[PDB]
Symmetry: D2
Subunit: 340 residues, 4 copies
């Protein structure tokens, strides 16, 4: 736009030299709505499974985590600009020692059992459908107490933490439930020893039973004409820090959704990214108007503001995570729902 003269050419040479970038050569710095580099994308469980198994064979140098890498993120191990999501495959009888990092993490168990993660010394047992938390700066290491492999998903705010410069890092009992649990998993009850609120949840594991039980009660209530479901046919719970009522960790939200056969959700645009895993059943997602059929274990990502919706063919169980707590804490969250 400026007259392209010698004097202007010399101004630009100076800019380059002095680490100045002018804004009138730039516009894309401030878009009309979010326009992620991350792309909607789906990973087929049967693929992730075979490559995780192969890894088990070829790499006893575990540790053995297959990071889902968004194709739009320039080769980084990021499923989105905020979140890492990986499949970790732990072999017969293997272990890891204790470390801590400021990054927040959860481990959601896909299939397997009889593995403990020891969180600040407290052994939390792991099982199909259990969500475990390793909040930032909690020592954690684990041990398989069985000849069997186990596969969980590993969800961290690694990409947020690497880009915002926030990372820090430092370096065999098998009880049936952890201390956290025995203390914190009684509904509406708070131990007088834990009257202090906490930034992350003290619940070590949100066991599948409770999740399943909750979702089913929401479906029964619909049948009985009671308010419960978020949308018709759509039962759903958010995993929460019980000291607070709020999200499990400062950076990550986790939920679980159960759709009744035939249910189709209304299209949402939400700010920030979310990942889903199909825990059980069959159905599809629509992202940017594109339908992708979905089987058990499949995972997919919905970057900021991508219009999305889900359809349950059978009864569709889906575990969910997002960076919504980052967007909400900073007043950046916005939501568009069809017909509202």
């Amino acid at each position: 736009q400026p007259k392209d003269t010698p004097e202007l050419r010399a101004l630009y040479k100076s800019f380059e030299e002095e680490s100045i970038i002018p804004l009138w050569t730039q516009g894309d710095l401030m878009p009309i709505h979010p326009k992620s580099k991350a792309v909607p994308h789906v990973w087929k469980w049967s693929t992730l499974l075979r490559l995780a198994r192969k890894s088990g064979e070829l790499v006893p140098v575990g540790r053995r985590a297959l990071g889902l890498a968004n194709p739009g993120l320039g080769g980084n191990a990021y499923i989105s600009p905020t979140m890492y999501a990986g499949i970790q495959y732990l072999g017969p009888r293997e272990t890891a020692p204790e470390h801590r990092h400021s990054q927040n993490a959860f481990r959601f168990v896909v299939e397997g059992e009889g593995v403990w993660t020891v969180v600040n010394g407290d052994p939390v047992r792991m099982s199909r459908g259990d969500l475990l938390l390793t909040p930032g700066w909690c020592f954690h290491g684990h041990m398989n107490d069985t000849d069997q492999p186990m596969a969980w998903i590993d969800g961290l705010d690694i990409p947020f933490s690497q880009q915002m410069d926030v990372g820090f890092f430092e370096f065999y009992a098998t009880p049936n439930f952890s201390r956290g649990e025995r203390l914190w998993c009684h509904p509406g009850l708070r131990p007088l020893s834990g009257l202090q609120n906490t930034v992350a949840s003290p619940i070590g594991a949100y066991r599948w039973e409770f999740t399943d039980r909750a979702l089913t009660e929401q479906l029964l209530l619909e049948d009985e004409g009671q308010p419960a479901t978020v949308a018709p046919g759509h039962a759903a719970i958010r995993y929460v820090n019980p000291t607070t009522g709020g999200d499990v960790m400062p950076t990550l939200r986790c939920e679980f959704h159960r759709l009744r056969a035939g249910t189709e959700t209304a299209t949402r645009n939400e700010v920030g990214s979310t990942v889903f895993q199909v825990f059980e059943g069959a159905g599809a997602v629509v992202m940017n108007g594109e339908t992708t059929k979905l089987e058990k274990g499949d995972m997919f990502v919905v970057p900021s503001w991508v219009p999305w919706s889900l359809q349950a063919e059978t009864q569709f169980d889906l575990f969910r995570f997002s960076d919504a707590p980052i967007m909400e804490a900073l007043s950046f969250m916005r939501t568009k729902i069809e017909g509202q």
Copy 2:
């Protein structure tokens, strides 16, 4: 203290006439520490039981609630300056219709079963050891679905509400658990339909099982050298609003305590008043240095700043309520513990 002359006598006559009270005739208006009019006092269950039964016979004009009246409160139906506590005796097959008041209330079940309280249309079943809430401004009425009597304690902030000028008042399914429960009583799980925080809990009933289960896990943890108990031998839980982590109602705190045989608590002075009921077991209280032996069902009151302590002879279960949420919300709470 002023020279007692005619002119001074005339000043006072004017004060009287003009509704002025001078402060130099007064001192007791601002005491060194709280000095309640309410007095520590104990009510023997066997007394409350026989008079409740007699009431059942003589008064089918129920409704039939025996208010514990502190001897120091000038004939008012107040167990303390903030709280009402009464025994309500509901007879074979009887009912009450729905009303609401701004005063907050709970009903803690002593012995009986098969009575529902219908809270805003949602029937909450009642049972030995269950705490039910009827938060302020929730419609509530009840029905006995059995030939049997039931006795619960009725705890309200009536005395606070009458003295601070805050009162307002307006005028058969038997399901096993209420909606609130089926929605809210799953540990660490929050329904997406209830992401709004609430001022009082949405848990209709805190059932005995959970309370018992929690307390027992705290005792087992002590045995195993884990932190859990508030004090050695002293297990304890606070009943909480799960949206928030905080107290059940804005004005009332409820807790439940379980002391291991032989445990003696350290003497506390706490600001505000508290009531205890012995749910199970035997032991004593010390209030103002005076030991009173205690049997199952006995109730007692500890006015603001009265030094108190409890001793478990057998294993001592005790349900608790207080006005602590009023003191804490207004920054008035103070605590003295022996050896701290």
Copy 3:
């Protein structure tokens, strides 16, 4: 209502003996809406002035505070069930030493100058129109550095504190502004040494200039078609704790109102009590439909739920206090405005 037999007469005798009051002899314990014992009432400044002066003569046993006593409160020194309001008359060159109580207090200066209140060692100068705070548990004593009398209003939560059992009590520089002020009275600016939030304000004095300046800018904005005034003609500010944005003290709200000549406010019923003083100008109040004409210095009380409204004859300046922070903190507040 029960059949009046011997056996019933014997039940009642037992009740009396065992400190039981049955609820079916009672109803008035839970009213349709608040029905205070406190009565609306007005005190004429010229009365309060002459009796304060007389006190100055007859009682050098100062200290010399004339408590406004509501006629409905059974002889207690309470202007309402929550608040004390008194006129303190400090004579030529007199002083008081330092004490503290948990009760919260302010001193609003009516006429006078050149008196300091020393709040935790920090001398806060006092002047016509200044609101000073002595938050609960802050040491405070004062000194007149002039041959002149001064009269301020003394507002405390004494009645709340005596009835709820919350009271505790323990036993010459003249700088132009206090430390608090020099630190805290710069708009939108917070000292890095005071990043901790506080329960009561650290502003020692809210000087008249700022109050006057604020109110006048709200009136000028109305003239210019800008939003500012709360109601048309009605300018108004709340005094606030700057660490927090909220009320000055946990128990007391203070505001200042300026009505343009001719303005009549809409009738309000508000829960809890409020006191007003006419700082400047002439007008009337309507309480329970009864109009009382009002001159400079006059004070009046509006108990919980009494319908009230104000009319400015000239431009009507009015200082305000209430127990609203107690009602709001406990979710007891309700408001009815005419035409809304």
Copy 4:
């Protein structure tokens, strides 16, 4: 680390194909402490001034903002991974129309006067030393009402917002103070029309007078042995949202520091990045042990965890901004101070 065989080579080929990155080829993803790509860097005012002037000549295609670009950020217009900082040079009588974006912004005036920024229709006048806010989603455009150039610094959370996918964007009175100001800039006073808390400040401009006045009172208090300064010789204020007590905008912190001649601050490592501008006086910074001498108008950046300290030769005034509110909101903040 795995045996480099055909079968392993084939596993990797699959990874590439399926958008899987394994974590055992990676480590740098989770560093011992933050290790920014952004580099500490200094921009000399006299450079920024001459290039801004040149821009004024060569580019009447304004708009005319010179973005400070960190040398470590791969050619992006980011002074840090969270913040943009630019010099905007507005020429004789020029203007911009109204737009809004979700990104948060301030404009801190370096030299100039008689320019208004119109924030949601409210004209805020601009002047040497004034901080103005254009919080996210507030319409803003401006106009120079004078023949003179003006230069301000333009601080936005553009880099955070572009990387986290949060951006949205939509498309002559000269009063002496804005409405916001006339309403909000009275110390400890809150208009009854603005009892709602706000996420960003409603103060349009934090004028130099108040900042200067505050800082000077903190220095006078030190002289008088009163607590005020954060560190000896170091006076300082945080700009704050008065509804809340907290930071001006959800994403950006602003402060102003005044060091007494000779003062040297203790070395800090803080998480997240900060920018400083020298408003007045002379001195140096030490970043990573490297001393850089500093003149009036110079700007410098301290990425996450870079040890930094400042030395005042004369009396050293410095305006400050950071992403600390992002770190604090997400529990990521950590601080190391020498000798603590």
